[PDB]
Design an enzyme around this catalytic site. Structure first.
Site, mmCIF file in Angstrom:
data_model
loop_
_atom_site.group_PDB
_atom_site.id
_atom_site.type_symbol
_atom_site.label_atom_id
_atom_site.label_comp_id
_atom_site.label_asym_id
_atom_site.label_seq_id
_atom_site.Cartn_x
_atom_site.Cartn_y
_atom_site.Cartn_z
ATOM 1 N N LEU A 1 6.717 3.075 1.559
ATOM 2 C CA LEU A 1 7.562 1.916 1.713
ATOM 3 C C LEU A 1 8.802 2.198 2.534
ATOM 4 O O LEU A 1 9.365 3.305 2.478
ATOM 5 C CB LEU A 1 7.973 1.438 0.343
ATOM 6 C CG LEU A 1 6.868 1.031 -0.643
ATOM 7 C CD1 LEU A 1 7.451 0.501 -1.987
ATOM 8 C CD2 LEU A 1 5.930 0.040 0.009
ATOM 9 N N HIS B 1 9.839 -3.487 3.297
ATOM 10 C CA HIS B 1 9.247 -3.748 2.004
ATOM 11 C C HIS B 1 10.345 -4.074 1.008
ATOM 12 O O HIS B 1 10.158 -4.847 0.092
ATOM 13 C CB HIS B 1 8.440 -2.564 1.484
ATOM 14 C CG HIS B 1 7.321 -2.160 2.384
ATOM 15 N ND1 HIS B 1 7.413 -1.100 3.268
ATOM 16 C CD2 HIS B 1 6.101 -2.721 2.591
ATOM 17 C CE1 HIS B 1 6.278 -1.002 3.944
ATOM 18 N NE2 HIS B 1 5.469 -1.978 3.562
ATOM 19 N N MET C 1 0.812 -1.235 0.000
ATOM 20 C CA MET C 1 0.000 0.000 0.000
ATOM 21 C C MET C 1 0.831 1.264 0.000
ATOM 22 O O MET C 1 0.354 2.339 0.386
ATOM 23 C CB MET C 1 -0.962 -0.014 1.155
ATOM 24 C CG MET C 1 -1.843 -1.268 1.135
ATOM 25 S SD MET C 1 -3.491 -1.111 1.888
ATOM 26 C CE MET C 1 -2.982 -0.799 3.578
ATOM 27 N N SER D 1 6.440 1.536 10.102
ATOM 28 C CA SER D 1 6.117 2.968 10.017
ATOM 29 C C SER D 1 5.693 3.506 11.398
ATOM 30 O O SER D 1 5.976 4.661 11.747
ATOM 31 C CB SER D 1 4.988 3.197 9.000
ATOM 32 O OG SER D 1 3.801 2.526 9.408
ATOM 33 N N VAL E 1 12.388 -7.219 9.162
ATOM 34 C CA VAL E 1 13.632 -6.511 9.411
ATOM 35 C C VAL E 1 13.529 -6.056 10.846
ATOM 36 O O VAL E 1 12.429 -5.652 11.317
ATOM 37 C CB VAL E 1 13.799 -5.258 8.463
ATOM 38 C CG1 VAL E 1 14.943 -4.353 8.861
ATOM 39 C CG2 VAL E 1 13.990 -5.734 7.089
#
Ligand SMILES: CC(C)(CO)[C@@H](O)C(=O)[O-]
Ligand SMILES: CC(C)(CO)[C@@H](O)C(=O)[O-]
Ligand SMILES: [Cl-]
Lengths: 284, 285
Positions: free
Chosen positions: A35, A39, A32, A190, A180
């Site tokens: 990134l 990602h 979405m 995020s 990660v």
């Protein structure tokens, strides 16, 4: 070759048909947008598994049960494309919602995965997982990948898509990619940006508490109730407000049985403005 | 040189091989117990692709009445022998335990809400979810260029078209007209459910539908009166009508001044059989 950027369905169709006719193995990484380096590890993994890698950027309204949350989802196409070109994506497909759902949301054909859509994270979010299985099915039909990469970070999503694929006859290898982590163990999200400086230094405790729980299981511990209570206690003592915690079968997300071969530990806890989550697979 | 495949891995092997050979693939989904109408689907498919795949699967997900599933005819060897003469390239005839290995309670499904709950979908709750689910699965397994369906199941065809548009399938959907017995009865595996006596009554459904179509050709447009009369005539000869409809042929909505073609949608019980038929009516003059 230069990375292609396609917004329309007809131009996408042209390209996918060309690759399919040429015999290229296609990987898909659905996103979405907005990134980050997590990602990018999806794209890296896809690259090793296919000839061409397609990455979608689509904020999917069908999975937002509060329609205003769409308005507030970050849109950063140029930044996303900068990153993707550097990681070797062959095609970025970035459609308008009007082109994906021209008949609206209420009467759009949908795909639903029983049980996995309505338990755990689905229980307080009616329609969320329907929106996920629907868009992913559509993307599979549009792009015809041989392989698709999803983050383990969003574990119920991963489990849902695996079930859909098995049930619906898709000849697609679904690859779960590990999250990660920072050097201190904090899973990348995020959400981490919403932490204060003091909160960022508490954050690594979520993984540490998780991994302490996983180690007990590796030796043989199975009193699930008690393990989780402990972990909620510890979360509180170091400054999180825990949400509900779970240890479930890695495939069905149901309570473990004597036939379960793999468990998943599912952690969630608030730290100021951020609800942080993490998970860990346990071989049984 | 026709192949028969039952297992999903063997099907995928063959579909991969044909794509490596550069072949265009047509799909003809069926529930077996094949008749001449089915053979005409196969003939049409052969004009649209290099290879034709015919599926035979009695899909339990679309039978909302357990007795109907129990009695549905199964004649696979007969079906296969017929298909060999019409030059089908592959028959895919899976077991239910392979299509739905854990049964139906937790099976992922596809719903087309625009069309699944009106008209025939109102008469058969749960039926169309079964159809869209299996057809989607078959499309995912086979990835055909084109798929051919009978116009006898008129609303099913509309539903599949909607599913394809909504779900991003790159598949051409072709409708083939209904094939009838010499006496006018629409061919159907369900006709086998009729007694000998009932089979001689069964043509009346078409006759009543066609008499309605003739009144509309002459300008009649009072739909509820037209349908009440058709229902009366069906009752008279020994049917029990289900809900009857006359709709716009394109949208399946009520007729409006803009409508150019109507579809008469008939459904009626004759003994243990629930029979359907339909007829297009050109409204233009
Ligand atoms: C899989 C996904 C792209 C579907 O919209 C979305 O849920 C996401 O990025 O997590
Ligand atoms: C399309 C079909 C094969 C799906 O099960 C079935 O509904 C049929 O033949 O009418
Ligand atoms: Cl049926």
């Amino acid at each position: 070759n230069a990375m292609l950027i396609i917004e329309t369905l007809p131009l996408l169709r042209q390209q996918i048909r060309r690759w399919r006719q040429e015999g290229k193995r296609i990987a898909l990484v659905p996103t979405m947008g907005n990134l980050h380096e997590g990602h990018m590890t999806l794209v890296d993994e896809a690259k090793t598994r296919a000839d061409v890698v397609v990455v979608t950027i689509f904020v999917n309204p069908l999975q937002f049960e509060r329609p205003d949350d769409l308005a507030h989802y970050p849109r950063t196409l140029q930044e996303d494309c900068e990153k993707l070109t550097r990681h070797g994506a062959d095609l970025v497909f970035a459609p308008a919602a009007a082109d994906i759902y021209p008949a609206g949301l209420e009467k759009q054909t949908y795909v639903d995965v029983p049980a996995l859509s309505t338990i755990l994270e689905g229980a307080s979010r009616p329609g969320h997982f329907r929106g996920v299985s629907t868009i992913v099915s559509k993307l599979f039909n549009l792009i015809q990948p041989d392989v698709a990469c999803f983050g383990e970070k969003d574990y119920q999503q991963l489990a849902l898509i695996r079930k859909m694929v098995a049930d619906m006859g898709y000849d697609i290898n679904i690859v779960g990619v590990p999250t990660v982590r920072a050097k201190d163990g904090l899973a990348l999200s995020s959400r981490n940006g919403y932490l204060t400086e003091e909160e960022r230094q508490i954050a690594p405790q979520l993984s540490k508490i998780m991994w302490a729980l996983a180690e007990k299981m590796a030796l043989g511990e199975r009193q699930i109730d008690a393990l989780l209570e402990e972990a909620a206690a510890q979360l509180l003592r170091v400054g999180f407000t825990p949400d509900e915690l779970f240890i479930r079968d890695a495939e069905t997300l149901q309570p473990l049985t004597v036939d379960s071969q793999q468990a998943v530990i599912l952690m969630a806890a608030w730290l100021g403005k951020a609800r942080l989550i993490d998970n860990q697979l346990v071989d049984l």
